[PDB]
Symmetry: D2
């Protein structure tokens, strides 16, 4: 049975464990530095195996040895430049344990700013570049896809969209790469089913969604968890989905030695392909600005 370790058992961790049991994906360790809490969540979640017809062990842990033999490790733990050293320390610690205990794990990093933190954990863990990625594009594009789908009254999954560069305020929303049922969004604009102005409003809403939800006396954890589990499941079941995630750039987009958000393929060997978009000059300028902010923060460590 696959073993999935959640390093961080906050709200996102809770939904992830719930979904893993629903999908019968693997045994789950809910790890956290906070005592008792993950044990309680794990106990609650384990009972849902009955309703789900599943058989996944769900355990809680404050003990790093439970990383042993993990097939997937998802890192949400962490404490705005002033947070960079603190969270780097966490990545140092986690990285050591990964190298010691599950060097062959597929690693998904969520800790913000994710495009910096994923590279830090890469550096501190020594795992292969095809075995560690950051959450970004699957989540951000889920917002864009959903809002467009509601304007056009179609199934959310039938909207495809790419958001690249970085996860955060400089995320690059590529209008040219939006399709609906495989059809260019521009055709729907031409047919007056949606306007350019509605699309720009949706772009603004997408960039600011975390803020919107925070201001609504909540915080995002359901969709982040679902995005992470889509990525993890594509690895565990070798589905080879095309998913936009943060990955090491080795020449793509003219960049090296930095992680950035780009479409890639997740299969049973990890990142099987990194897909380099043929961005035009203006799109490329936006991509470069996103990654430049990642570089700026990386240089501060």
């Amino acid at each position: 049975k696959p073993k999935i370790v959640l390093v961080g058992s906050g709200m996102i961790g809770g939904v992830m464990a719930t979904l893993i049991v629903q999908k019968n994906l693997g045994d789950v360790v809910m790890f956290d530095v906070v005592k008792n809490m993950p044990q309680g969540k794990a106990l609650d979640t384990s009972h849902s195996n009955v309703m789900a017809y599943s058989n996944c062990k769900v355990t809680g842990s404050n003990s790093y040895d439970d990383l042993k033999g993990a097939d997937v490790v998802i890192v949400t733990a962490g404490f705005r430049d002033d947070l960079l050293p603190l969270n780097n320390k966490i990545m140092i610690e986690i990285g050591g344990h990964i190298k010691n205990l599950c060097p062959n794990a597929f690693i998904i990093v969520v800790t913000n700013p994710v495009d910096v933190m994923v590279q830090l954990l890469f550096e501190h863990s020594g795992v292969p570049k095809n075995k560690i990625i950051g959450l970004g594009g699957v989540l951000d594009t889920s917002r864009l896809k959903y809002y467009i789908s509601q304007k056009l009254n179609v199934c959310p999954r039938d909207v495809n969209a790419l958001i690249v560069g970085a996860h955060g305020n400089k995320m690059v929303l590529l209008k040219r790469y939006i399709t609906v049922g495989g059809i260019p969004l521009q055709e729907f604009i031409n047919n007056k089913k949606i306007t350019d102005e509605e699309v720009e409003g949706i772009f603004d809403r997408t960039v600011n969604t975390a803020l919107e939800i925070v201001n609504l006396l909540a915080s995002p954890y359901v969709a982040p968890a679902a995005a992470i589990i889509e990525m993890a499941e594509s690895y565990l079941k070798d589905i080879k989905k095309v998913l936009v995630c943060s990955t090491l750039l080795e020449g793509q987009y003219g960049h090296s030695n930095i992680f950035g958000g780009t479409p890639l393929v997740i299969g049973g060997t990890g990142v099987e392909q990194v897909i380099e978009l043929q961005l035009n000059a203006e799109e490329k300028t936006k991509f470069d600005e996103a990654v430049a902010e990642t570089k700026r923060m990386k240089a501060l460590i």
Copy 2:
């Protein structure tokens, strides 16, 4: 598209909305008297439609008119005898809205003490007796089934067990009615795969599980949500599952005018059958004690 209204958008409500989207079961209204919070949770949850390949609207509301045309209403709202009047007031209010806005809804009550509150909402809403039930047995038995399954190393769902009478400390764990893969538990005791003492320990753990989880710096909401959605789904898809829930007793077990936990069948018309267990005298004594506590609290309203 079916419409499911969650009256109460706390932790249990959050997991319920998540699961409804995963299962593509229906549009969801997350209702709460707390402003903004359900709107935030609903917005977050709606994005997960993309990952789930679903198309369920998820909206938040502080407005009771959103009960209009609900097919299923799940009540978790509410504020230990001294809480009975307070929560009764809530049931009065909700009941009026149900009668006005969704008199044909299937109603699942969770507010504790559930066996009292479900009858109060029945009385204040005027819905048919086959259209309103309380959460209890599916949740409690999920604990018992799970713990036994881990002792015997089998799939949790392959353990069947009945817990009856009431949801709470007087719940009746019927040892005679435990089976594993359809086989009496006694055969596994005879074969020394599990002992009577282990089973009694598991009974104690089952009764006190909420307390265990609360003491572990958490609180149960994942398994409660999964239990509720199993009940709701059996109604919405006319599955006719046998599920132990709190229902109006009309002569069964010698009781009338009171709700108690018993196996029943949930299908597209609501409670299609109430199954009366042929309890022996000792089991019956325990059942009567559970329901007597429900009567005691009902008499205080």
Copy 3:
């Protein structure tokens, strides 16, 4: 519980009934003019409810009254111009029963040539134009999507493609409308991950797939059944998927009074939108040739 009637219980019908039970989608009537056969298939299939955790009645019938109250009707029955009158007779008979017994059903026609037969059944049944469609594009594009996905080593569903006009040898494969993870196929050609020549080979293979399978001592029924059930499920669950199907053209593509393959949206009210592709002149010429063959055969009835 939804009621799905399969008018025709051959191989495609068998797989459809199997999938409906797996998905717990509705009660199934397997209708056929051949005595006993559908009763046997239905009996076999009904047992699989146990393995699937479903509760769908599956019955066999040689009796047209079992169309009564059908929510979905799928027509595969039928006996190459010389077959047109014969199959028209079948559509006359079925049409009468539909009008009498399930005038509100959503109708999916498969009988070939489907773009002619769907219009004949429309004419003989009197159902609204938004409530009857023909199988074509979902099946044909499943071939194109699959073959491209195997060249590029990605999840089959992540390839999107449109095939329009008609189902049969004149089907129009729109190279410009192929995307992979939302990205234009041309980018993958530019990057030498696939060539124009491979794509043309795949186009030829797609057009001739039925012939390939027939020559391999088989015949296609699994993918046709899966395509039909994807369409039916989008209706039954109001998913509003964008699916390419044969539908009445009322001005789109400059055509009237004829059915043709085009992207459309299937939701709970039937065809909720017909999407008119903004074809260029060359693409339009191919579309017109496909539909001209449909017109030619329609004129022979």
Copy 4:
């Protein structure tokens, strides 16, 4: 990705491949000695990956080397005592290839008479006794469970029942071990929801179901395929379901050196437990008669 090889690509094989793709369970090889046919079925089935959101390779083969690295092997190939030598020859051939090419595979045998043939393949393949079982109980009990569920108007899966000894006319239907929602069937008889006479009629129908379906101008393959895939999935996902299958008896029921139908647990290591029912004397007499027929035929090889 797990690899599942179907040795035999007839009707049962076709449904198995279909279900494996629906469940995204693994790559599939459809093997058959008949040329071209499995290649055609495999090609058809592979396209359904698009509709299922799956990524399973489906290939056809007449070449035994495609057994290499199989995780699961399902044997339906084979040509009434006079058929025993013929089918034994097939088991000799297959057995050699298994030992050579996939000695660690989990093997499910279907070829009739299954309780004899599974032991022959065990003997000719050299695989461990916990890694090879025969289809019987899951299929037979699916009939019994389904028919009882329709009498009582409950979800089919909520009926549990055990049928033991052998698969065929001497199958032992254990009335004492039938439960409904975990409740003894006898309670439903006492309450006049079903009679002893109805139950005996259902027993007769269960024993003779294959004959019923054959006489209805069909033959059973959907439910057999679903039963086999339930067994295979319990292995592949380590679910540890309790499933009644044919397995080597090593003292259980007083028998040795023979395979018989009994509840057992299927998990990731194969047969993890063989559960010996505590049969009473009369039940035991019936069990012995079933297994005696298996012994009689085994002695003829």
